[PDB]
Design a protein around this ligand. Structure first.
Ligand SMILES: O=c1ccn([C@H]2C[C@H](O)[C@@H](COP(=O)(O)O)O2)c(=O)[nH]1
Ligand SMILES: O=c1ccn([C@H]2C[C@H](O)[C@@H](COP(=O)(O)O)O2)c(=O)[nH]1
Lengths: 316, 316
């Protein structure tokens, strides 16, 4: 079925990946270099063998797409994927006056009595970002994230490039171009960012009226990360194809280091017992064409019928 | 044999690639997204089914490695891969006083009586670059090429990053790093360079004392280009492994658009009749460790026994 490539990457890491330490007290099993294809005319690759929240995956992408770097848009669609990086900033800053909150990510997962204060402060931090304008502008704004790297790359003569807007324009006028490339890796920010981007670079490709997209992903968490990554970029393929009025082609997903966390073996094995169902269909608004001004209600998912979600611990 | 992946990419493009126009009056057959592996402990992947000039492939890489961007180093090892980009500059410039030389690449291949003056001027241009210092500095210097993109990426606050020197340092001290990435794509130069780099980005990887390298190549000429590309980067894998004292692992070659030019079908079919021979062995100087100061005589090839070379026309 559509998703087999992903079930094949999980199996491949299980009986083939080697043990490799990382930023965590536990390790990972990992491989290096891996490529998968999804024919997007076959259906949309949201996993069926595990419930994946599309609304999250899509409100994040819109954010990227508007070139926004402020958490606030996200909070307003109840999407919190990005709160820990914002709130970190808050905490290491003058203006903050609360229980230190040092190394809160690790310590969220030991103490059930800290994990309860972290969850209080965070709710207030989210609250202030949502209502206090001055506040958002100071700690709601992440600075370097995909949205500005895509739509406002800072030059050396202090202006701004919209890589993606220009690229889309190129697709419209030089479809056979071999240089349709949006990159998110700036070698001058990289050594001082707490997260240099995982989604390093991608490249668009046109042939016979079809748009395809290859993603170069330096590092992928097979269980938690890669199910979301797949849908993000398959959605982007669709949106760009829609804006250029091209038919949709293939999403190619290339990896550097694909890993599975050692405390996720059981969950992943559980996943491999399930038998894929038919893929959902994606469905974009026909009246609206500028994808830059797309909203939530413009992108529908149809016939998504997943297995239950698989809760799992996180890696810290 | 070691090279099968390449013979498998050529076949794959033959009975599977679709017709696609490009910068040339002829087309290309092409595919999008492709990955190959070469286990470098099995031997060095210089093609055996077609004579490939190692000396060229290596004097180019040393140049990159010294962070040089001046043609002159190259001329001094009789390597001309880069002369047309230098000389172009010359020609569209005040100081030049000769037969116009407009669109010389196309017109080199029609007129056997132009192709003879182009070959005269070029010999003089090469001569001046070799002997006139002021001259080299003005037209010998290509500006943006791999050597400065690797070793002197210009920042926004007007300094210089040595991506590769830093990366190597990282390999030495954080071998399990998932961010060992040297990128050659600067979104701010890209729209005004006559050749935005083909070799877009690469990433190093370490496990069990072995170094591997994945290359993201946006565009590859399967017949002319890709045999050289393979050895460049397999050499680089070796040199970096040597400097970090790690064993050598795999070279993974990832492609965006892999193409074959329509006037190279016959040559490629001829190539597929040949039967690979055993791979040559690479052999680097043990006394010298700083790869930045490696010379020609420090890198030997052993037991390279190729088939004859396959001359072919070029695409213009
Ligand atoms: O969409 C995402 C976002 C993050 N990660 C993971 C990969 C790693 O587990 C971690 C990044 O750590 P480094 O790879 O930078 O060291 O985030 C994913 O797999 N997918
Ligand atoms: O080492 C090299 C250098 C160049 N090319 C080719 C690929 C294309 O034929 C051409 C670049 O043109 P664009 O892809 O930028 O349009 O150079 C290679 O395959 N390998």
């Amino acid at each position: 079925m559509l998703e087999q490539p992903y079930l094949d990457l999980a199996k491949k890491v299980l009986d083939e990946g080697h043990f490799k330490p990382d930023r965590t007290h536990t390790g990972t099993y990992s491989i290096f270099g891996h490529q998968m294809r999804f024919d997007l005319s076959k259906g949309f690759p949201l996993l069926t063998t595990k419930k994946v929240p599309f609304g999250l995956i899509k409100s994040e992408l819109l954010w990227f797409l508007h070139g926004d770097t402020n958490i606030r848009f996200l909070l307003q669609h109840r999407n919190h994927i990005w709160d820990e990086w914002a709130f970190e900033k808050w905490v290491k800053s003058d203006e903050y006056h609360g229980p230190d909150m040092t190394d809160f990510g690790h310590r969220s997962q030991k103490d059930p009595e800290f994990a309860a204060v972290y969850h209080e402060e965070m709710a207030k931090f989210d609250d202030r970002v949502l209502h206090d304008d001055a506040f958002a502008a100071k700690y709601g704004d992440l600075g370097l994230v995909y949205g500005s790297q895509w739509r406002a790359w800072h030059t050396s003569k202090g202006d701004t490039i919209d890589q993606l807007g220009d690229v889309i324009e190129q697709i419209k006028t030089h479809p056979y171009s071999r240089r349709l490339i949006v990159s998110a890796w700036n070698p001058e920010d990289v050594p001082t960012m707490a997260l240099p981007p995982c989604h390093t670079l991608y490249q668009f490709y046109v042939n016979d009226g079809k748009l395809s997209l290859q993603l170069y992903q330096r590092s992928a968490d097979i269980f938690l990360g890669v199910p979301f990554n797949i849908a993000s970029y398959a959605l982007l393929t669709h949106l760009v194809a829609h804006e250029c009025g091209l038919e949709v082609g293939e999403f190619i997903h290339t990896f550097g280091d694909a890993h599975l966390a050692v405390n996720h073996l059981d969950q992943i094995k559980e996943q491999l017992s399930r038998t894929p169902r038919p893929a959902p269909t994606l469905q974009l608004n026909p009246d609206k064409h500028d994808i830059f001004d797309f909203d939530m209600k413009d992108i529908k998912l149809l016939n998504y019928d997943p297995y239950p979600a698989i809760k799992a611990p996180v890696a810290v």
